[PDB]
Amino acid sequence: GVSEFLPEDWKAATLLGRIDFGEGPTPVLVRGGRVEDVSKIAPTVADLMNAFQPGAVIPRGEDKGPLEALDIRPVWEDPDGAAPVKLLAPVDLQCLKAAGVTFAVSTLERVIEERARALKIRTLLAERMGGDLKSVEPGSQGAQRLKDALIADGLWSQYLEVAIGPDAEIFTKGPTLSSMGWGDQVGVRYDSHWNNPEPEVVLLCDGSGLIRGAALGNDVNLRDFEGRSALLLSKAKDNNASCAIGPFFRLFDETFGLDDVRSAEVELKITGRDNFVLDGKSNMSLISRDPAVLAGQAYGKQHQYPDGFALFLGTMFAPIQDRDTPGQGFTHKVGDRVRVSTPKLGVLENEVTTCDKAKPWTFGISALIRNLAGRGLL
Amino acid sequence: GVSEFLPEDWKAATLLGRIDFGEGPTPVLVRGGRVEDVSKIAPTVADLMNAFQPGAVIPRGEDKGPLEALDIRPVWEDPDGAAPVKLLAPVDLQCLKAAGVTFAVSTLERVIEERARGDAGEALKIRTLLAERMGGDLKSVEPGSQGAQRLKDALIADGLWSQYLEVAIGPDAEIFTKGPTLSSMGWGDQVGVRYDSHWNNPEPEVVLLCDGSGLIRGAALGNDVNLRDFEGRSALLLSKAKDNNASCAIGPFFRLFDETFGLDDVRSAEVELKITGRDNFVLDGKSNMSLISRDPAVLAGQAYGKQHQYPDGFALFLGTMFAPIQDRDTPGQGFTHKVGDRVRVSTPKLGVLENEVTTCDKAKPWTFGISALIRNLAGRGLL
Numbered sequence: 223g224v225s226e227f228l229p230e231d232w233k234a235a236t237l238l239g240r241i242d243f244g245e246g247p248t249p250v251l252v253r254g255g256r257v258e259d260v261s262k263i264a265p266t267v268a269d270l271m272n273a274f275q276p277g278a279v280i281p282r283g284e285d286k287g288p289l290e291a292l293d294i295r296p297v298w299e300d301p302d303g304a305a306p307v308k309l310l311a312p313v314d315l316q317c318l319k320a321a322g323v324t325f326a327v328s329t330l331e332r333v334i335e336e337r338a339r340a341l342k343i344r345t346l347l348a349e350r351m352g353g354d355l356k357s358v359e360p361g362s363q364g365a366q367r368l369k370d371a372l373i374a375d376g377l378w379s380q381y382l383e384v385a386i387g388p389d390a391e392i393f394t395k396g397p398t399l400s401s402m403g404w405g406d407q408v409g410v411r412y413d414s415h416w417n418n419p420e421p422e423v424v425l426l427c428d429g430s431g432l433i434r435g436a437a438l439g440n441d442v443n444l445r446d447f448e449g450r451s452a453l454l455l456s457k458a459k460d461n462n463a464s465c466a467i468g469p470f471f472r473l474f475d476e477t478f479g480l481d482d483v484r485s486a487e488v489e490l491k492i493t494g495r496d497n498f499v500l501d502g503k504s505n506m507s508l509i510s511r512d513p514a515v516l517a518g519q520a521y522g523k524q525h526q527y528p529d530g531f532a533l534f535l536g537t538m539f540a541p542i543q544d545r546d547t548p549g550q551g552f553t554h555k556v557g558d559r560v561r562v563s564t565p566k567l568g569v570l571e572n573e574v575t576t577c578d579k580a581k582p583w584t585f586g587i588s589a590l591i592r593n594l595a596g597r598g599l600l
Numbered sequence: 601g602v603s604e605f606l607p608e609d610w611k612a613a614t615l616l617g618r619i620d621f622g623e624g625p626t627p628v629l630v631r632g633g634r635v636e637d638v639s640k641i642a643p644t645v646a647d648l649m650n651a652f653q654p655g656a657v658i659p660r661g662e663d664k665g666p667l668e669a670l671d672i673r674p675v676w677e678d679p680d681g682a683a684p685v686k687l688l689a690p691v692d693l694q695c696l697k698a699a700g701v702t703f704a705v706s707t708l709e710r711v712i713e714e715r716a717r718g719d720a721g722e723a724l725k726i727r728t729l730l731a732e733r734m735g736g737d738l739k740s741v742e743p744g745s746q747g748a749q750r751l752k753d754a755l756i757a758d759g760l761w762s763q764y765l766e767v768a769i770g771p772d773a774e775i776f777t778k779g780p781t782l783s784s785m786g787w788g789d790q791v792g793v794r795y796d797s798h799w800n801n802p803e804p805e806v807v808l809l810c811d812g813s814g815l816i817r818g819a820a821l822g823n824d825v826n827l828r829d830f831e832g833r834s835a836l837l838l839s840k841a842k843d844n845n846a847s848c849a850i851g852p853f854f855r856l857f858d859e860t861f862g863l864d865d866v867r868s869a870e871v872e873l874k875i876t877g878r879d880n881f882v883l884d885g886k887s888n889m890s891l892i893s894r895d896p897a898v899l900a901g902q903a904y905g906k907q908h909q910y911p912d913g914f915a916l917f918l919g920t921m922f923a924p925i926q927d928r929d930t931p932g933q934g935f936t937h938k939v940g941d942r943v944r945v946s947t948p949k950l951g952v953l954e955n956e957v958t959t960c961d962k963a964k965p966w967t968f969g970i971s972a973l974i975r976n977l978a979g980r981g982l983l
């Protein structure tokens with residue numbers, strides 16, 4: 223069932239992704255429900271977005287027929303890759319960037335509720351800032367007053383700095399071409415004991431720093447590493463198969479735009495072999511920094527991205543549901559299936575294993591170059 | 601002129617890098633003091649390293665003449681790029697990785713900036729407390745050992761523990777992405793400090809070249825341009841403190857390991873830092889790689905393995921050996937960059953990496969990425 227991970231109105235949508243039809247990764251546009259191989263128009267997704275700015279007509283690629291007729295199978299049904307067609311992550315040459323601590327209200331309230339083990343705390347804090355904590359504006363003067371009041375209470379932390387300060391937390395999620403897509407295995411380090419998915423929306427940005435579309439993401443996260451030291455953030459975020467993006471980027475058009483991202487309800491479901499089930503659901507409406515503002519902090523006068531970039535927008539999901547150890551929260555088991563979904567983008571589903579058991583990352587930039595050159599696409 | 605930034609024995613060395621002769625980036629070897637265009641052997645440095653294993657002789661490329669005869673000029677003598685030949689960063693497709701707090705002088709200054717919340721005006725008082733309290737304890741254990749665990753417990757009981765000490769002496773080194781692939785500056789380039797940073801510094805380092813099998817192939821010098829006010833405000837701003845336009849420099853070339861040069865030379869390298877400014881500030885200092893807390897091969901083995909691969913290879917900054925605190929403008933306020941600063945990182949076996957500092961917004965933007973490289977190579981018939 224291919225149709226089950228697509229947006230509800232996907233035949234009216236413009237989807238952009240990558241498919242291996244048997245000869246290597248191929249940029250595809252899905253329009254009118256039909257797949258177009260656009261590799262002769264541009265050999266990569268990054269190249270396509272740079273060749274056709276917003277507002278430009280993208281010509282038609284080679285007809286590959288209806289999308290739901292392609293024999294696409296996920297890894298948990300097709301371990302050996304018997305399928306004649308493989309769906310890939312919809313990024314290729316883009317840098318993989320991620321924002322974190324973008325939902326500042328829940329960060330603040332979790333700090334307060336940890337201190338309370340609350341009314342008096344929220345009262346004095348809101349009066350120093352000059353308004354309700356639910357209205358905190360990161361990087362504002364009210365946020366500076368809140369910062370100082372929190373330093374005075376002994377509640378300040380480096381996480382609150384990126385929650386309400388002028389600079390958002392933005393980091394490199396993984397190397398270019400290393401992302402997993404729909405139906406792939408994702409990896410948690412074998413030496414991580416406390417880890418979780420992070421259900422997110424991922425923006426697609428072109429080499430001019432313009433937002434072009436959005437996909438779902440799983441920012442696989444190793445809590446025990448980051449908890450020992452924030453300087454292990456990279457090691458908690460960037461390992462073999464630790465990034466999943468997909469199934470397609472949905473491009474902005476008459477049917478879909480950034481305002482639909484701004485109000486998207488993102489759902490998470492984790493299903494284990496042990497019959498564990500976890501559900502979580504969170505609205506992008508509560509994000510404390512606008513997606514365009516986050517993109518503008520990643521890209522501007524002081525950082526460019528000539529091949530474009532993808533940007534995870536962060537999450538307010540908290541992995542506090544106990545699984546097997548009371549008090550310590552969630553952690554993955556091998557074989558967990560993780561679904562991240564939202565109606566306008568479809569469903570990103572992956573299966574969890576450890577980083578050493580997932581297939582190694584072998585198809586890098588040089589591998590792509592040789593593949594594209596051998597096909598005459600350059 | 602050109603020999604001033606090369607190894608003292610450079611005509612006997614094997615140097616690997618990238619030059620634009622006027623048609624685009626070209627992998628080159630410098631052997632016998634002569635430049636070889638090896639683009640017909642492999643179109644990129646990353647491909648060259650994946651095609652020839654360590655110890656295998658790389659065949660001769662196309663002779664381009666003596667290196668010192670090429671009209672190579674740095675940006676402070678050629679601001680508009682009139683020179684017909686340009687030396688580039690010696691990396692192309694490699695990921696740019698960096699290790700942190702591998703030298704005790706850096707570890708102490710990280711804890712100081714953390715306690716100051718990135719405020720340079722607080723550093724003097726905090727340094728006065730912490731240098732005395734923690735002096736001589738960091739290098740008393742091997743990182744990741746049982747001894748290091750007992751030291752951690754002592755420091756926690758002292759009220760001296762920090763998330764930076766966790767990566768200084770714990771089992772997991774701090775390794776992060778310094779910048780995107782193809783974004784590095786090289787010798788003679790401008791490097792960029794963010795214009796909204798007011799507490800920043802160069803970070804001289806030795807940079808390993810590793811291939812797609814994780815093997816260490818050679819070494820270059822590096823400058824990990826760093827923003828203390830950003831990282832001090834929050835370690836979650838590490839990436840913003842490290843990764844901005846033109847914030848990474850590697851060069852002048854990678855010296856490949858052979859009979860004249862090996863990892864043991866990397867392990868004992870004396871590195872010199874010189875900073876000069878338009879205000880006639882001068883800083884000059886030296887330190888030795890033997891002070892590193894984790895062996896370079898151990899750092900490379902933490903970066904690459906069963907849980908992270910790098911099919912195009914990677915460069916690895918080994919960690920800064922300097923943390924400048926010399927007062928520039930105000931007594932007790934320490935150092936920060938000004939536009940026009942010249943930073944020279946040098947060691948006898950590798951030469952000199954020299955850059956001119958400006959702000960990120962004034963440096964030329966990063967425009968030549970992966971697609972540009974692919975198009976350039978394809979158009980030259982090199983694929």
Ligand SMILES: O=P([O-])(O)O
Binds near residue numbers: 276277433435474
């Ligand atoms: O290219 P857009 O119109 O989908 O953003």
Ligand SMILES: O=P([O-])(O)O
Binds near residue numbers: 388518
């Ligand atoms: O807000 P900025 O300085 O990250 O653009």
Ligand SMILES: O=P([O-])(O)O
Binds near residue numbers: 699700701774831
């Ligand atoms: O922790 P640092 O040394 O990478 O700033």
Ligand SMILES: O=P([O-])(O)O
Binds near residue numbers: 701702706824918919
């Ligand atoms: O990791 P660094 O900041 O010492 O280069």
Ligand SMILES: [N+]
Binds near residue numbers: 275276277280434473
């Ligand atoms: N588009």
Ligand SMILES: [N+]
Binds near residue numbers: 519520524
């Ligand atoms: N920024």
Ligand SMILES: [N+]
Binds near residue numbers: 701702707920
């Ligand atoms: N460091």
